[PDB]
Amino acid sequence: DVTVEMEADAVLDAEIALGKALPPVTGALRTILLTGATGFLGAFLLEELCRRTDARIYCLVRSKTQEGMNRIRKNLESYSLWNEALAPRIVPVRGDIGQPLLGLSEKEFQRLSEEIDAIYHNGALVNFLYPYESMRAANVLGTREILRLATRTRIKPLHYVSTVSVLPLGRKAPIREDEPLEGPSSLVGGYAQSKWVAEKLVREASRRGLPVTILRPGRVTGHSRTGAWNTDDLVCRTLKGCVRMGVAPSVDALLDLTPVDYVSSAIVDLSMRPESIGQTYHLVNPQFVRADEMWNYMRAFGYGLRVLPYDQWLSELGSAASSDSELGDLLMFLQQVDRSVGGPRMVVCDSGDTLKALGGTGTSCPSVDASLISTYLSSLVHRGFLKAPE
Amino acid sequence: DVTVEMEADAVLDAEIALGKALPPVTGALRTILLTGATGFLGAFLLEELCRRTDARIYCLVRSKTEQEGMNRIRKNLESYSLWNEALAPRIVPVRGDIGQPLLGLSEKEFQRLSEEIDAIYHNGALVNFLYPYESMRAANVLGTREILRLATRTRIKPLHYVSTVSVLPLGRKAPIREDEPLEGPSSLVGGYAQSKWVAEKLVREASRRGLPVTILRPGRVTGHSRTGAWNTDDLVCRTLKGCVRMGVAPSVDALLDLTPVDYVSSAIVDLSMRPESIGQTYHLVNPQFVRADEMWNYMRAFGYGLRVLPYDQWLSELGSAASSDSELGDLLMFLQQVPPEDRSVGGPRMVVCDSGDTLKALGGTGTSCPSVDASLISTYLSSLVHRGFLKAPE
Ligand SMILES: NC(=O)C1=CN([C@@H]2O[C@H](COP(=O)(O)OP(=O)(O)OC[C@H]3O[C@@H](n4cnc5c(N)ncnc54)[C@H](OP(=O)(O)O)[C@@H]3O)[C@@H](O)[C@H]2O)C=CC1
Ligand SMILES: NC(=O)C1=CN([C@@H]2O[C@H](COP(=O)(O)OP(=O)(O)OC[C@H]3O[C@@H](n4cnc5c(N)ncnc54)[C@H](OP(=O)(O)O)[C@@H]3O)[C@@H](O)[C@H]2O)C=CC1
Numbered sequence: 001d002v003t004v005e006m007e008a009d010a011v012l013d014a015e016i017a018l019g020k021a022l023p024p025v026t027g028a029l030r031t032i033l034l035t036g037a038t039g040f041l042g043a044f045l046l047e048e049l050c051r052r053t054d055a056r057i058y059c060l061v062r063s064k065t066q067e068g069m070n071r072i073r074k075n076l077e078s079y080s081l082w083n084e085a086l087a088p089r090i091v092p093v094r095g096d097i098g099q100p101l102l103g104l105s106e107k108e109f110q111r112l113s114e115e116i117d118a119i120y121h122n123g124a125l126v127n128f129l130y131p132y133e134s135m136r137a138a139n140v141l142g143t144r145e146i147l148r149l150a151t152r153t154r155i156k157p158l159h160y161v162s163t164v165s166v167l168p169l170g171r172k173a174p175i176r177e178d179e180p181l182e183g184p185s186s187l188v189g190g191y192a193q194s195k196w197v198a199e200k201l202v203r204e205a206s207r208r209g210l211p212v213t214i215l216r217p218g219r220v221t222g223h224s225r226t227g228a229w230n231t232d233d234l235v236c237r238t239l240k241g242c243v244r245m246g247v248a249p250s251v252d253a254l255l256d257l258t259p260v261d262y263v264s265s266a267i268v269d270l271s272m273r274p275e276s277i278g279q280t281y282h283l284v285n286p287q288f289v290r291a292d293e294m295w296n297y298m299r300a301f302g303y304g305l306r307v308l309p310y311d312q313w314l315s316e317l318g319s320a321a322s323s324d325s326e327l328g329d330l331l332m333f334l335q336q337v338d339r340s341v342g343g344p345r346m347v348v349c350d351s352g353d354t355l356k357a358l359g360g361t362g363t364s365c366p367s368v369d370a371s372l373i374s375t376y377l378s379s380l381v382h383r384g385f386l387k388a389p390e
Numbered sequence: 391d392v393t394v395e396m397e398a399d400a401v402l403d404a405e406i407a408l409g410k411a412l413p414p415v416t417g418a419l420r421t422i423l424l425t426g427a428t429g430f431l432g433a434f435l436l437e438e439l440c441r442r443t444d445a446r447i448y449c450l451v452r453s454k455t456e457q458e459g460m461n462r463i464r465k466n467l468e469s470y471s472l473w474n475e476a477l478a479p480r481i482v483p484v485r486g487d488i489g490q491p492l493l494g495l496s497e498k499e500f501q502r503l504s505e506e507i508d509a510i511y512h513n514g515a516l517v518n519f520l521y522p523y524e525s526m527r528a529a530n531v532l533g534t535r536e537i538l539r540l541a542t543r544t545r546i547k548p549l550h551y552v553s554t555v556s557v558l559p560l561g562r563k564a565p566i567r568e569d570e571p572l573e574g575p576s577s578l579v580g581g582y583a584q585s586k587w588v589a590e591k592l593v594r595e596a597s598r599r600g601l602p603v604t605i606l607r608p609g610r611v612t613g614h615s616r617t618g619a620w621n622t623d624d625l626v627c628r629t630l631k632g633c634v635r636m637g638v639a640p641s642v643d644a645l646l647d648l649t650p651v652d653y654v655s656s657a658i659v660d661l662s663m664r665p666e667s668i669g670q671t672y673h674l675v676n677p678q679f680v681r682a683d684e685m686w687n688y689m690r691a692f693g694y695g696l697r698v699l700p701y702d703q704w705l706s707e708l709g710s711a712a713s714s715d716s717e718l719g720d721l722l723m724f725l726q727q728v729p730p731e732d733r734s735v736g737g738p739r740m741v742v743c744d745s746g747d748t749l750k751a752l753g754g755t756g757t758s759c760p761s762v763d764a765s766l767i768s769t770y771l772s773s774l775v776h777r778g779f780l781k782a783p784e
Binding site for chain 1: 516521526527723726
């Protein structure tokens with residue numbers, strides 16, 4: 001039972017504590033550690049942090065070197081977020097969070113525990129096929145070693161990127177941001193299981209006096225103006241799927257789409273508030289969308305789409321899968337546990353405390369309308385992922 | 391559930407029968423239809439048939455033009471050290487899709503094929519262990535249905551059908567004999583097993599209706615016993631590279647089966663030209679079982695270090711390893727999908743067959759199954775190292 005190994009992992013080592021660590025900095029941030037800079041959200045996080053702060057962003061990246069900066073640079077460039085002015089703000093740090101001490105020597109880790117003022121832990125292995133064991137190192141031990149730095153030499157505030165996937169599916173009443181964490185058993189998939197464990201670890205460090213914010217994004221999607229978006233995204237995969245065979249599923253679940261520019265603005269905004277310490281926030285769209293509505297938006301852009309019950313739609317996918325290898329790659333994702341006629345289940349959240357904490361900021365989630373979809377679709381079209389609607 | 395789809399599908403359409411078709415050739419074969427000439431066994435089949443008959447081999451191949459299909463065929467055999475340019479005039483490439491009605495031919499092309507072809511070796515099939523039954527319904531079931539339609543169109547054509555030992559129930563007290571009929575659908579795991587089960591049900595119905603058919607159930611088919619030739623996309627090649635790469639292997643209960651392709655090829659051709667074979671079913675599997683630890687000993691002997699762990703613990707370390715390793719992750723997907731009974735301590739179950747009826751049929755042919763030993767495994771690994779699939783040892 002995987003649950004037996006999760007519980008054991010959710011225990012934080014006794015020596016991960018404030019102990020005799022010097023107090024957190026009270027002035028402005030001078031140096032920040034960000035993980036996941038070569039990823040989707042990390043890119044907009046990195047760029048947002050350069051804009052809203054004057055701190056040097058230390059970016060932990062997997063690479064063979066000065067090769068880290070190029071990975072970072074390329075990543076931001078793929079989203080239209082890079083300028084040369086960013087280069088001096090960014091300090092790549094060669095590492096691997098799936099290793100002890102983030103893959104640094106004892107000597108390098110000690111130096112880091114002295115230079116870093118605050119931590120934005122965004123890095124994680126996101127994979128919807130792999131079992132728990134696959135993501136144990138990066139997600140569980142990665143977070144454990146983050147807490148180890150956060151408490152080493154001098155206290156460092158931790159802004160932790162978690163997911164709403166830590167909450168049980170198949171629930172009518174949205175989940176409030178203050179409700180405590182449930183059993184490990186209520187969870188499906190190795191990713192959710194790993195993030196569940198990680199958040200347990202973080203909550204333990206918080207209860208032990210480390211200054212921590214917990215941010216649970218929902219389904220994060222493209223930048224609402226430029227439409228910049230990760231095409232390796234399952235949502236993106238699924239979109240091409242339906243397009244290319246001209247049929248979409250009916251699902252009774254309410255759909256959440258949170259543009260990444262909101263999510264990243266929100267993270268920075270909430271991280272800058274002393275009131276956020278100890279708090280959890282659901283960074284999801286305040287406004288939910290229905291299945292058929294997104295289909296309407298997509299027809300309007302020009303793509304034809306027959307609408308089928310989810311079940312009958314997976315069947316057609318199965319058949320088509322024997323045709324395309326990309327369509328098959330998507331079939332593997334959808335062929336697990338949620339396959340019935342009303343679609344897959346998915347969590348529903350309240351974002352009350354978030355909307356409240358952000359009411360005084362210029363940070364508002366974009367609304368999901370036909371205009372946003374067109375921004376997204378046009379982007380995928382112009383970038384070659386999709387063929388232009390006839 | 392899918393067994394209900396399976397059962398509906400195992401029903402051979404009414405019109406697929408003998409009726410007014412001219413009887414089968416009784417003279418020498420003039421033309422042969424071979425499916426799957428771009429695949430592994432088909433390459434060896436094609437070479438056996440070319441060597442052992444004087445017929446022209448019509449190879450149904452997926453391509454944009456005929457000359458591309460010929461190039462596809464050509465390249466395949468060469469990858470196995472099977473090609474020879476004397477074979478070119480022997481081969482008649484045939485553009486089509488066995489997952490399409492009439493194999494992807496027009497009514498006119500289909501009628502003309504139904505006039506030319508004297509016998510059918512149906513070896514083409516979608517072999518995929520991740521996809522569901524619905525993904526392989528087209529090639530395996532309706533593909534087989536359409537071949538049976540060809541075999542009964544205009545004039546009768548004997549069919550030699552490559553099935554698989556995987557249509558057989560797993561975990562049974564006795565090695566399944568070639569004589570026992572098919573069990574129900576419910577006890578087959580995986581879309582692949584399920585589509586082949588359906589396909590064999592179809593072929594047996596046609597048989598019952600009087601179509602001359604041979605049913606040939608290969609076991610796990612492996613590299614050529616002398617050259618060591620083998621297709622790397624193979625799940626057994628896949629698995630072996632894994633264990634090598636991560637320096638550990640699982641200890642399993644199951645008796646393993648290894649059948650070199652050159653024995654399968656030859657036995658299929660052999661049995662097919664025996665008139666005693668019609669209506670009969672044969673199990674082309676290695677008569678001698680090998681054990682897990684035996685196999686690990688042969689590869690250590692070749693030079694590869696291998697720790698031995700229990701399947702579940704080996705499977706767990708595979709999980710850990712797949713974090714950074716796409717191809718490791720890829721392999722992990724195959725094994726995680728197997729039902730709990732075959733993901734346990736002793737590892738995956740696997741079927742055990744008898745090949746008595748095959749031995750007698752292949753009394754004196756010079757055709758027998760090579761043995762599994764360090765020597766065979768050395769031939770196998772040298773090839774893969776040479777092909778560059780494997781890094782050499784030490
Ligand atoms: N809709 C969404 O995408 C959601 C995201 N989140 C969370 O946001 C965070 C970012 O997700 P997202 O941007 O979408 O995913 P990405 O896969 O695009 O980015 C993952 C980042 O994590 C890095 N990473 C993974 N493993 C390691 C490792 N062992 N060592 C160092 N770096 C590593 C990756 O570096 P590398 O390039 O080397 O792989 C990459 O930069 C994650 O924690 C995710 O769980 C939460 C809810 C929803
Ligand atoms: N260990 C083994 O290999 C065993 C194999 N078998 C059976 O042997 C036969 C072939 O096995 P194997 O050689 O290993 O597999 P391969 O995948 O190597 O060969 C598959 C062959 O089938 C062709 N094929 C698949 N789909 C189509 C299609 N829609 N139209 C035309 N051709 C198609 C392929 O052509 P293309 O290249 O264009 O895809 C290819 O020529 C199968 O019937 C299999 O069930 C049975 C037991 C064991």
